[PDB]
Design an enzyme around this catalytic site. Structure first.
Site, PDB file in Angstrom:
ATOM      1  N   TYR A 193     -16.937 -99.817  15.627  1.00  0.00           N
ATOM      2  CA  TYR A 193     -16.040 -98.505  15.871  1.00  0.00           C
ATOM      3  C   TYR A 193     -15.478 -97.810  14.757  1.00  0.00           C
ATOM      4  O   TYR A 193     -15.050 -98.671  13.783  1.00  0.00           O
ATOM      5  CB  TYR A 193     -14.913 -98.610  17.015  1.00  0.00           C
ATOM      6  N   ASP A 199      -9.655 -90.565  26.132  1.00  0.00           N
ATOM      7  CA  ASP A 199      -9.837 -91.462  25.347  1.00  0.00           C
ATOM      8  C   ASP A 199      -9.440 -90.812  23.993  1.00  0.00           C
ATOM      9  O   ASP A 199      -9.254 -89.619  23.657  1.00  0.00           O
ATOM     10  CB  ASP A 199     -11.301 -91.690  24.975  1.00  0.00           C
ATOM     11  N   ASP A 231     -16.304 -86.501  28.794  1.00  0.00           N
ATOM     12  CA  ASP A 231     -15.744 -87.573  28.140  1.00  0.00           C
ATOM     13  C   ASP A 231     -15.081 -87.082  27.048  1.00  0.00           C
ATOM     14  O   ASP A 231     -15.611 -87.244  25.977  1.00  0.00           O
ATOM     15  CB  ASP A 231     -16.737 -88.421  27.976  1.00  0.00           C
TER      16      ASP A 231
END
Ligand SMILES: [Mg+2]
Ligand SMILES: [Mg+2]
Ligand SMILES: [Mg+2]
Ligand SMILES: [Mg+2]
Lengths: 271, 286
Positions: free
Chosen positions: A89, A111, A142
């Protein structure tokens, strides 16, 4: 004071991290206020994944008090693969508590990509400012909030999305690329962004965040259209699912990190 | 069999790693043969720095048996900084033993003296290596870095155990199986000391990665420089410790130098200052 309680060894199926307030487990989804300072739009961020790590850790909606655990598929632990030129990440990755994309809503707290210098720790509650937001289509809508820790040296100089271009040139491009390709090594398709991948500004981001807070308020009050989701909380006394005993039922802190299979080292060239 | 002997905790000034054969330290500079298999140009690489780490661990030329110790800048532990989009070193980073970038002559390809170190090796395979590892690698090509104005060739290599090793035989194969890596490599070695306050580095040949044949020639040159050094015949050996336990015809051979090394005292990794997390953005803003 927020701390963490770790059950089991990291990188195992048994691993769980609970957030503690003054020694006592609380829900990471419900009991952490969205706002650290509402007037100035300072948010509490629950951190799942330290920058440059691979284990796909997340708040689980279905276990009591919603500990952070490792995602699994058909019984196997999930690690995001290294996608050149990226390592794991590329942000501190987490979520805003007391938010929920009511499901097209993706069925999870919104998120958060936290872009500051310090690598965060799993179960950390930090205070962040929102700088902007991107709309990924993953499979579903998302949103990815771009945020920075208010304690970052650069925080006073970052207030809106254009400041990310100034102080972090190329990070927005990297973010676009990363979310497009990161599941390709798993044999899933490239993802797509709305708005041609543009990051919308802070004002736009606050609007989306507020909406998901409002949905969660209806969720925790038991007024949502909520199957699969445990709503137990230990700090909201007038909710149907308040249960202080839940905090006491959590086991005590457990182990050294388990080894990660060497395959996770591999760098994939799919950029 | 090669093993490691660790003294102290990683990320401290007291940390040392000696390479051992038969459970006894040997010189990591002088005693590990350059070739694992001379006929097939398979080389022994001493690994200093695992991919995606920062601590600038290196063979200590001036210490007896040349243990790996963390470099220091004006007394403080040296960590290479993260330069976006990279995380630490982007290769398993180390050296070929029995080589030397001769600092006493101008090298004709770069018109600069050597950096006084063994030739550096960028090992590009999938598995992250460990400090003090001796692995066997094939050379694929080489780049001519001028590191603060000094000849500082970088060999591109692959562990022979890598799943891809059979498919990688020359430098063009690196671009095929690792597209973008050579270009990133050029960038990395240009920019990595900018956060230290140093100028950008430059490469000869406009950063071209020369092929395996070219690489073998340069590796030979550096091995020849080392042969002169270890024989005591360099015009200036720069206070390098030439003590070795395997080269009987050299003036500084001493089998018993090994016995004098302290035993292992391995401790858990020490924490690293959170400053080393920082990602540096060196340009590209609109
Ligand atoms: Mg998921
Ligand atoms: Mg989401
Ligand atoms: Mg140096
Ligand atoms: Mg060098």
């Amino acid at each position: 004071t927020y701390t963490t309680r770790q059950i089991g060894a990291k990188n195992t199926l048994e691993y769980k991290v609970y957030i503690e307030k003054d020694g006592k487990p609380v829900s990471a989804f419900h009991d952490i206020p969205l706002y650290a300072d509402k007037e100035n739009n300072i948010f509490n961020m629950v951190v799942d994944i330290p920058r440059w790590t691979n284990a796909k850790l997340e708040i689980t909606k279905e276990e009591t008090l919603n500990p952070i655990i490792q995602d699994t598929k058909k019984g196997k632990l999930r690690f995001v693969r290294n996608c050149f030129p990226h390592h794991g990440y590329i942000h501190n990755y987490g979520a805003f508590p007391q938010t929920w994309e009511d499901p097209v809503g993706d069925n999870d707290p919104i998120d958060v990509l936290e872009i500051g210098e310090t690598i965060a720790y799993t179960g950390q509650v930090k205070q962040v400012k929102a700088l902007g937001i991107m709309a990924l289509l993953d499979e579903e809508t998302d949103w990815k909030v771009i945020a920075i820790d208010i304690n970052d040296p650069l925080a006073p100089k970052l207030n809106d999305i254009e400041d990310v271009e100034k102080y972090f040139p190329g990070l927005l491009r990297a973010t676009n690329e990363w979310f497009r390709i990161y599941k390709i090594p798993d044999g899933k398709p490239e993802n797509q962004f709305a708005f041609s991948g543009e990051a919308k500004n802070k004002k736009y981001a606050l609007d989306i965040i507020k909406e998901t807070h409002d949905s969660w308020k209806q969720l925790i009050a038991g007024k949502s259209s909520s199957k699969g989701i445990d709503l137990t909380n230990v700090t909201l006394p007038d909710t149907p699912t308040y249960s202080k005993a839940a905090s006491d039922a959590i086991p005590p802190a457990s182990k050294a990190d388990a080894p990660i299979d060497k395959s996770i080292d591999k760098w994939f060239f799919i950029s």
